[PDB]
Design a protein around this ligand. Structure first.
Ligand SMILES: [Zn+2]
Ligand SMILES: [Zn+2]
Ligand SMILES: [Zn+2]
Length: 85
DNA sequence: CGACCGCATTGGTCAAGCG
DNA sequence: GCTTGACCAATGCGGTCGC
């Protein structure tokens, strides 16, 4: 009840197995409300949420896409990939 | 051009810690 | 049992530099 049905890795914390398993089945239920980011770990999505704005720092929003960033240096990454026009 | 180099972000991993 | 976050390496970029 603790081993991966797909490759047989053995987990002593079974919750680790339920997350690992999605590496095979591709399920990504933790979906960001701010972008199309998704992941198989609740931990990761909250960590990714920092990238959308810190509490004490000035936030940067996409002028086209209303999307908020905390660091400018990844906004234009979103400009190039999503706003080529 | 190609190969280095700093950074913001990430995927994988793990297990303390809970009460 | 289950959540949470630290850790690490990988990534990808943008830029730099190289008998
Ligand atoms: Zn597996
Ligand atoms: Zn997001
Ligand atoms: Zn945008």
């Amino acid at each position: 009840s603790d081993t991966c049905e797909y490759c047989g890795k053995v987990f002593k914390n079974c919750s680790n197995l339920t997350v690992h398993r999605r590496s095979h089945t591709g399920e990504r239920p933790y979906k960001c409300e701010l972008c199309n980011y998704a992941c198989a770990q609740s931990s990761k999505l909250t960590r990714h949420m920092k990238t959308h704005g810190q509490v004490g720092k000035d936030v940067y929003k996409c002028e086209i896409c209303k999307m908020p960033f905390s660091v400018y240096s990844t906004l234009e990454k979103h400009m190039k990939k999503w706003h080529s026009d």
